[model samples]
Target: STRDYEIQRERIELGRCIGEGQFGDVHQGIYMSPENPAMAVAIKTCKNCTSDSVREKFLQEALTMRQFDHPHIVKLIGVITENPVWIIMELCTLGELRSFLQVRKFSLDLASLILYAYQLSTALAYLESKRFVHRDIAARNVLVSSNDCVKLGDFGLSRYMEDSTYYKASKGKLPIKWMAPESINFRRFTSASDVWMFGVCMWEILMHGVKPFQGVKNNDVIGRIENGERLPMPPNCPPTLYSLMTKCWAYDPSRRPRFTELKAQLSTILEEEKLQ
Candidate 1:
């Protein structure tokens, strides 16, 4: 069935470059077919993967996305398997969350912020149910549509990509600020890292455009984290949201709340804010 998802190069009318990386470029494209018509799409192409090992992993990229069908998760429409392999995905016109928020230029009140948070939690809850641990969760990877819909994407998708630099955010993305202490120290990744990163992502949302620990250098992040330093509360962050963030950033991984609980709490907050 994996072969069934293969698409011909001719079928994708590649357009202007929407994104770029060391390995390849992501283009806004249209899939031309009788069944699919000329639907807008995203075509991610790669290069320099000649090794059998790398090629094997490239095929696995499609498998990674095969089981994912949640509303918040980005859909994998198909893949192109010739030289310079192509992975086709749903087009996100508005782009990443940070850029999306900046483009809108609208202040995110508690309700707006909570809605985004709840949606992220919904995706996390789904990943958790599938026993998948998302070590990297941030606003940069949350792609937004022109209509304000958001989809969760993977930055750790570097396995699907060759270059590490491809994942770096043009807008202040510090992965160290989100990693759980144990993960940074012992390489012990868990669902707890997801919670910790979720908290950092929340902080990013609340703070709008500021990078966490901006002045601190890379050498200091580990010490600061182990020394009980955490992201400071944003200027307009509501007390309720702050409280939830603190729990998510708990020193002990086990103390962190589950994604399902996070979904419930965030959704409840959004609903309650609607009334008052």
Candidate 2:
């Protein structure tokens, strides 16, 4: 109910629909704020805002955004809270990272791929330092700001760790394929679990957006993980990077590197690859 980030609706000029979101369609638009020139933005529309509960939930997303400030994390411009609530966000010109990678699979260089992983690690490290657990850390949840930059987006599944190191999961659908064994079994989500998902996300980027386990049933995936199975190294992937990813999938969550550690390790790998 605060007016701090509230934006006047008339200042927004809606553009073409970019994609579908949890609440409804996401649109690319232009916002004309008095303090600045027209700005390209992404607008998140709520289709079921008629329901009080859903409207409150939708607004919570905007509130969550206000708490975070990072170059590699998408920003919340403002919110139009009147009828047909809208969330104005910074637009990533290249859009979803997965599709962007898939489209450029043949043309993109390996160094650039390593750089994407490094960038995301830095973002994840920032979130970890803030004690925020980003449950969904995958290529699909990331967006490309440009040919060389990727930003973590879609914070719908993120939650604050608060005073606890772990979040006890509530019943809801989960991205099982990207989850760690502990998370799949005990519903315990922590930064360690997020690290596991980040490994899979990094793998996805290296694979040019190929899913972690193609054509595998969800139940089978759980069994495979229990049997100590991990996603195979992508063809042409640097063995060193793959070794780091394996550390993230360690059955014992404590064995997994913290986001800060991962970020540092990735920096070394990125620099090494740049020289090659």
Candidate 3:
């Protein structure tokens, strides 16, 4: 389906090529409403791809993002199907958390790490409450806005529990480093697996955004994790936080904490940090 819209006369190009990814590129644009000028927008355009799964993934991403209105999740403004699909979303000036952390020299204080983890836990809890799982959650998927607030983005692999049968059968391509052991070994994933991945994400955030198993190969990492080998907490991470991460990466899925519990524990950490 092809769709097009007339560009408002007051629209202006703020800049070009602010960000680029595998499927698309983002441009910083400004659309001035007649009544209220100076409104900023971020327009993302996907490149030509003949793969049906790619198109379906893009559509699913847009549809899923449009369904929720949460503070921690990025908002989708509109969709355009003119030639290549275009996704209009809130302008996230700060870009991905991984890049931001790298630019800051990979040094994060405990308070900062706790605040970010709390935000992520709350977001995941909200999604779990709605019976949806963000199959892909990592530092790169998190966008930091100019205001220092975190927004979870990139829902290409996200699927509701009811839709699990469709994708679960194939056990589609997943990031091995951040994936739970069961997900890679048995091709089985549940909310519990998501929680396990969340622990890895927390470790990444706390360790100055280091990729999980920095020097290890993907297969080796998966094998080691499945064999009950846990990645050591990076130096300087608090003992309490390290314990929580270890619990999350437990060999048995049943032993993992639910998002609700994670949210509450992270909240406590944040409160304690605020007092210190």
Candidate 4:
């Protein structure tokens, strides 16, 4: 019902622009939360807005975002439907996880990386329960907060999944690099495919935010993946952890473990690390 989401424009108080997106600008803001009276929030304005087909897809996206309430997944607080449409969310104090990893590279001990990766796999377990495919699962899409929480956001492209997005070299639609060969061939994105991206994400943590296929064009990389090639294992990445990535990067999607399997393996790894 519109009554559930429609908020009168007068209630929101805006502040400075915190970030920008393909949709609109994000700003820090103050808003009265019926759930908690005094709370700071992030307001994202949806841009160029929508048409018939886009409207239905936006609703799907919005509804998916609105209902998620898990520890590791970023929550969507609410939205404003009026002109200059806005989405309210919990404020993430630190920015991109990739940038954080870049600046604090060596200082972010391997245990911390394992802890965060374990948390994300836990989150993926939750999303898998709900049967949602997170098209974007890279470190760049992960965010951290003041308390060192990894919040996965930015449910990414459906149509754009087919095309590749590359590094500085070629202009091919390059986002496909993190994807599984099954996704590249059939465009059949599901939790099984997300596991493949999660493998690359683990590699990102091992490399401390370095892009997976740095110089290789994303499209050209598919042939490599087809030929059973994988990213060079990070220097001294624990054999146990790197082995998990190889399983995730398996050529047959059916060979890949689901989030439930992923969660248990990650748990065992983290527990063993604690023992060491």
The estimated TM-scores of all candidates read 0.88, 0.96, 0.87, 0.86
Predicted candidate 3 versus true structure: per-residue lDDT over 1-276, tens digit per residue: 853443433354545888886578888787666676665677777776456677666666778887788888888766665545666777777888888876765445678777888898988998988878787888988988753478888887787887353236454556898887777777666788889989989988887678888888887887787677987877777777888889999888889999999999888877777786
Query: What is residue 147's positional error in candidate 1, in angstroms?
Result: 4.1
How big is the positional error of residue 177 in model 2, measured in Å on the Cα after superposition? 0.7
Which lDDT tens digits does candidate 1 get at residues 109-165? 667767778888998888877666666687877887654467888633422223121
The number of clashing residue pairs in model 1 is 0
lDDT of each: 0.75, 0.91, 0.77, 0.77
Ranking of predictions according to lDDT:
2, 3, 4, 1
Q: Model 1: how far is 224 from its true place, Å?
A: 2.1
Q: Best by lDDT, which number?
A: 2
* Residue 63 displacement (Å), model 4: 1.8
TM-score ranking, best first: 2, 1, 3, 4
Clashing pairs in 4: 164-173, 164-174, 165-173, 165-174, 165-175, 166-174
- The candidate scoring highest on TM-score is 2
Q: Could you tell me the lDDT of residue 112 within candidate 2?
A: 94
- Alpha-carbon runs more than 4 Å astray in model 4: 1-3, 33-35, 50-60, 156-174
- For 93-167, candidate 2 gives per-residue lDDT tens digits of 899988998898878999999999999998899999989998889899899999999999888778998848667
